[PDB]
Scaffold this active site. Structure first.
Site, short mmCIF file in Angstrom:
data_model
loop_
_atom_site.label_atom_id
_atom_site.label_comp_id
_atom_site.label_asym_id
_atom_site.label_seq_id
_atom_site.Cartn_x
_atom_site.Cartn_y
_atom_site.Cartn_z
N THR A 1 0.84 -1.35 0.00
CA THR A 1 -0.27 -0.02 0.09
C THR A 1 0.73 1.20 0.04
OG1 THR A 1 -1.69 -1.19 1.09
CG2 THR A 1 -1.87 1.38 1.30
N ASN B 1 5.90 -1.04 3.65
CA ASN B 1 5.35 -0.33 4.65
C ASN B 1 6.05 -0.53 6.00
OD1 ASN B 1 2.70 -0.38 3.31
ND2 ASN B 1 2.24 -2.32 3.71
N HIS C 1 -3.09 -1.98 -5.70
CA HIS C 1 -2.29 -3.15 -6.12
C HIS C 1 -3.32 -4.12 -6.16
CE1 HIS C 1 -2.69 -3.97 -1.82
NE2 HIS C 1 -2.20 -3.29 -1.46
N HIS D 1 -0.29 -9.79 -0.71
CA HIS D 1 0.23 -9.13 -1.92
C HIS D 1 1.54 -8.62 -1.40
CE1 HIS D 1 -0.67 -5.37 0.12
NE2 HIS D 1 -1.89 -5.77 0.60
N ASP E 1 26.12 -0.17 -15.17
CA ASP E 1 25.31 0.61 -13.93
C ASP E 1 26.03 0.05 -12.68
OD1 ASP E 1 23.72 2.55 -12.61
OD2 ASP E 1 21.98 1.00 -12.60
N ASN F 1 26.73 1.96 -10.08
CA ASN F 1 26.05 2.39 -8.93
C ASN F 1 24.49 2.15 -8.76
OD1 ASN F 1 25.38 3.97 -11.02
ND2 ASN F 1 25.96 5.86 -9.78
N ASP G 1 21.63 2.77 -10.05
CA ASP G 1 20.92 3.90 -9.74
C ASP G 1 19.87 3.91 -11.20
OD1 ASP G 1 22.51 4.89 -11.79
OD2 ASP G 1 22.98 6.66 -10.88
N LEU H 1 20.75 4.48 -14.05
CA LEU H 1 21.16 5.48 -15.04
C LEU H 1 22.65 4.78 -15.57
CD1 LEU H 1 20.38 8.58 -12.97
CD2 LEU H 1 18.92 7.30 -14.55
N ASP I 1 26.13 5.00 -16.30
CA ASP I 1 27.41 5.16 -15.73
C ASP I 1 28.12 6.33 -16.53
OD1 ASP I 1 26.57 3.53 -13.66
OD2 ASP I 1 28.52 2.34 -13.76
#
Ligand SMILES: *[C@@H]1O[C@H](CO)[C@@H](O[C@@H]2O[C@H](CO)[C@@H](O[C@@H]3O[C@H](CO)[C@@H](O)[C@H](O)[C@@H]3O)[C@H](O)[C@H]2NC(C)=O)[C@H](O)[C@H]1NC(C)=O
Ligand SMILES: CN(c1nc(-c2ccc(F)cc2)cs1)c1c(CCC#N)nc2ccc(C3CCN(S(C)(=O)=O)CC3)nn12
Ligand SMILES: [Ca+2]
Ligand SMILES: [Zn+2]
Ligand SMILES: [Zn+2]
Length: 785
Positions: free
Chosen positions: A154, A175, A304, A415, A665, A667, A669, A671, A673
């Site tokens: 949630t 959660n 969900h 879930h 990649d 690191n 992230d 994205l 490198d």
């Protein structure tokens, strides 16, 4: 000290003056008369005919007297029962071509109706169970399903809905969470969760407020009946122009609450679904009563789904690990392990890996998890993760768990599992003037929604993980038009520059101008490079590539394999052939000596020699400009993909275009490198080792047309395979590749967009399709479910 005049006040009062806001009950800070004035329940939420034109009794929850409209407190069904009007649901769909709003309204309001644990398949239940929701669905715009983020819990999904961000970026990664920088825990129960320090990005209520658009309070204390939540929203909508919010949210804990008790398909689920629908009917009747039913955009959306999960389907770490008392486990439908302060990650991963025939969880370092999950780049994510099989839980030890004293489980549904799992999918419906009429749209990820909601309110979105424009097909009017990014680095196009002799690369081998290669092997234009680099376009009969003189390998390799393509062998005489490329300086080329000195690393080829068009053409496949560092364990995967699976896909899809390349990649992230971020090289060299290898496989959605002669929309599947020195991830990996490789690939399926983030490339730049359509294609994820 009074709530008189202030129930559900929008401007909450600070401490210590008592409160009357939506959340005062959760702070135990309500004024004394809050229950009495703001939570009235007498006589329920529906006018009956015997109440029509009653004398006003103030104790009543809602009113049926003649002054009720002027007081702003009629029941939602007042006009229906007392004034002969129809329920909204009994009216036929009517296209709202334009918002029809009162004077003063500067934009159509948005109401988000959010339902907890509303599994996508609950929509099949139909008009006899949920007449109101089914009208919204069939009159408005709807998707077959909407995919949640992982974990499919949630708080991560609600906040994603609100921010457009992956959990790892918004920071609500579960959660339950521990933050080592705060040295504090976050839990669904307790007041910690209200503290702003946990909540990153910029949610829709903040975005609105920052841009001069008022929001209603999105959050509601549990003790506020659903019917009161709706009446409050409706009442806020009648506020004067200078006070009236433009954006609202209703939230319901159903059908999740029941789903956990009875399972998603328990017959008892019909009642909650009926009650939710009634709540929806009260909203729509309410709006119609206010004559805002052709003014307001309504989103019906879940966080969900829900899966069948019972306490007997629990794996225990104590069956795998000795000294299980050294570890903290976040348990359930996922696992996160950390130490309590004996603990050692490598021992733990190894002891949990491929140990039982039917093992219903897989351990991972978080950086090795599928990239599609985008679940690693946050200090709140433990290094050790367990992915749990649908229908199962993981726990630390038996006595950590407890059944009821009667012996039955507390739950039959749960879930939190991988967000590709069918059972975890939830719903999206949009209805109102800005949405399309009676339109179905493809399923989409929930990260995309924040941008839509912003567009619906004329807001500039905060930076988020949605692809803005990818859902323009939902709307009849778009406030945002996507534009294709400008290419940052132009390619060089080298001809023959060097001679064989000038190459001392330590290689051995037993001994092109565009033309129509671009037409055949690059079907959707050249990819653009969206970062500063130096790279070369290399043409060949059978493939085209963008070769980086920085990373000493292709950024991308593109080729088209027809349905009838023939798979051939690597001739014995070309087994270990690597050839210099006369178009590329020795200095910006890989070398074979590096590989011999690196005892762990071998090499492979991006364009497969197996799919050469002729013996002569096959020599191009052994160019040094086509090779990439590959661990031997990885080559088992890649060789099977190249020799077997490419042909299969081509055979099934009436040809395929393939683009493959490296990803770096280090690191984690998600994205691309920088070179400074690469942490491993082929020994003694500056050949960077990829962390992953991608492939984009495109064909015609209309399979009756070959991939290279496609008129209409396209069809894509993609993957981002981890470049691992072992296949410990695949428990059947000691068998033939036919038993495990393709399942590995399916697990690491990806969106084109994920690859774009990871490479700094932009694909599909030259097609006969609109850019919006292309954005949709790039956000598609093939799930295999
Ligand atoms: C999902 O969306 C978020 C939000 O846009 C992305 O996070 C953002 O990433 C950028 C680029 O890395 C961060 O800004 C830049 O960071 C570099 C590195 O220090 C700096 O040199 C730049 O000047 C700039 O500040 C930005 O801080 C960050 N924002 C947030 C909210 O964390 C994220 O990358 C996206 N994820 C994927 C996988 O696309
Ligand atoms: C996250 N969250 C909720 N999200 C929604 C929601 C509804 C529609 C939608 F499209 C997207 C999100 C409603 S409420 C939550 C809930 C559970 C649901 C309820 N009610 N409970 C709480 C309690 C507190 C808060 C905080 C979150 C952080 N801030 S902040 C600092 O970002 O302004 C304050 C309130 N959220 N919350
Ligand atoms: Ca990176
Ligand atoms: Zn939920
Ligand atoms: Zn739940």
């Amino acid at each position: 000290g009074s709530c008189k005049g202030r129930c559900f006040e929008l401007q909450e009062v600070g401490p210590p003056d008592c409160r009357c806001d939506n959340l005062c009950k959760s702070y135990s800070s309500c004024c004394h008369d809050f229950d009495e004035l703001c939570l009235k329940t007498a006589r329920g939420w529906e006018c009956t005919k015997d109440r029509c034109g009653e004398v006003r009794n103030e104790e009543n929850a809602c009113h049926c007297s003649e002054d009720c409209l002027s007081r702003g407190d009629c029941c939602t069904n007042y006009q229906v029962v007392c004034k002969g009007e129809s329920h909204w649901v009994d009216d036929d769909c009517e296209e709202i071509k334009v918002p029809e709003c009162p004077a003063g309204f500067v934009r159509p309001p948005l109401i988000i109706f959010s339902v907890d644990g509303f599994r996508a398949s609950y929509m099949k239940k139909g008009s006899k169970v949920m007449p109101n929701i089914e009208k919204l669905r069939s009159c408005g715009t709807h998707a077959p399903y909407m995919r949640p983020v992982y974990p499919t819990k949630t708080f991560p999904n609600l906040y994603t809905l609100a921010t457009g961000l992956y959990p790892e970026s918004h920071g609500i990664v579960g959660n339950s969470m521990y933050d080592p920088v705060f040295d504090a825990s976050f839990h669904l129960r307790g007041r910690e969760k209200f503290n702003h320090r946990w909540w990153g990005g910029q949610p829709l209520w903040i975005t609105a407020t920052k841009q001069g658009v008022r929001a209603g309070t999105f959050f509601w204390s549990v003790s506020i009946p659903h019917e009161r939540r709706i009446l409050t929203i409706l009442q806020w909508l009648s506020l004067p122009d200078n006070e009236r919010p433009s954006v609202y949210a209703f939230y319901s804990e159903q059908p999740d609450f029941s789903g956990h008790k009875y399972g998603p398909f328990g017959p008892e689920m019909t009642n909650p679904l009926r009650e939710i629908d009634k709540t929806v009917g009260q909203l729509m009747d309410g709006l119609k009563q206010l004559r805002l039913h052709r003014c307001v955009n309504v989103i019906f959306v879940g966080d969900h789904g829900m899966e069948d999960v019972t306490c007997d389907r629990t794996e225990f770490l104590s069956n795998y690990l000795t000294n299980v008392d050294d570890i903290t486990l976040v348990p359930g439908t996922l696992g996160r392990i950390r130490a309590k302060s004996k603990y050692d990650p490598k021992t733990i991963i190894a002891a949990l890996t491929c140990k039982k025939p039917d093992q219903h969880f897989k351990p991972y370092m978080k950086q090795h998890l599928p990239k599609r999950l985008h679940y690693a780049n946050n200090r709140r994510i433990e290094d050790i993760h367990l992915l749990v099989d649908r229908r199962w839980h993981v726990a630390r030890k038996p006595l950590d768990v407890y059944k009821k004293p009667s012996g039955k489980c507390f739950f039959q549904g749960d879930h939190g599992f991988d967000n590709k799992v069918n059972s975890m999918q939830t719903v999206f419906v949009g209805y109102g003037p800005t949405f399309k009429y009676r339109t179905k749209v493809p399923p989409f990820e929930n990260i995309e929604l924040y941008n839509v909601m912003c567009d619906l309110l004329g807001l500039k979105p905060a930076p988020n993980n949605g692809t803005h424009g990818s859902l323009n097909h939902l709307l009849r009017t778009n406030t945002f038009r996507p534009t294709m990014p400008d290419e940052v680095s132009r390619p060089n196009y080298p001809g023959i520059m060097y001679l064989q002799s000038e190459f001392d690369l330590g290689c051995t081998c037993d001994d092109h101008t565009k033309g129509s290669t671009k037409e055949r092997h690059l079907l959707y234009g050249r990819p653009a490079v969206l970062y500063r680099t130096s790279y070369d376009i290399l043409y060949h009969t059978d493939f085209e590539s963008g070769y980086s003189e920085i990373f000493l390998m292709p950024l991308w390799t593109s080729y088209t394999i027809s349905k009838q393509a023939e798979v051939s062998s690597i001739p014995e005489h070309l087994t270990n052939c690597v050839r210099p490329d006369v178009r590329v300086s020795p200095g910006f080329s890989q070398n074979c000596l590096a590989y011999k000195n690196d005892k762990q690393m071998s090499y492979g080829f991006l364009f497969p020699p197996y799919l050469s068009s002729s013996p002569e053409a096959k020599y191009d496949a052994f160019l040094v400009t086509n090779m990439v560092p590959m661990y031997p364990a990885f080559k088992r995967v890649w060789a099977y993909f190249q020799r077997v699976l490419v042909k299969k896909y081509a055979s099934e899809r009436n040809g395929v275009n393939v683009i493959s390349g490296p990803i770096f990649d280090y690191n984690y992230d998600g994205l691309r490198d920088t070179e400074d971020e690469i942490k491993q090289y082929v020994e003694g060299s500056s050949i960077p080792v990829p962390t992953h290898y991608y492939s984009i496989i495109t064909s015609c959605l209309d399979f009756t047309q070959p991939a290279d002669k496609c008129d209409g929309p396209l069809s894509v599947s993609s993957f981002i395979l981890p470049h691992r020195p072992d296949n410990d991830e695949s428990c059947n990996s000691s068998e033939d590749e036919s038993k495990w490789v393709e399942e590995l690939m399916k697990m690491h399926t990806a969106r084109v967009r994920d690859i774009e983030h990871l490479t700094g490339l932009d694909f599909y730049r030259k097609t006969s399709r609109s850019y919006s359509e292309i954005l949709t294609l790039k956000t598609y994820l093939h799930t295999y479910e």
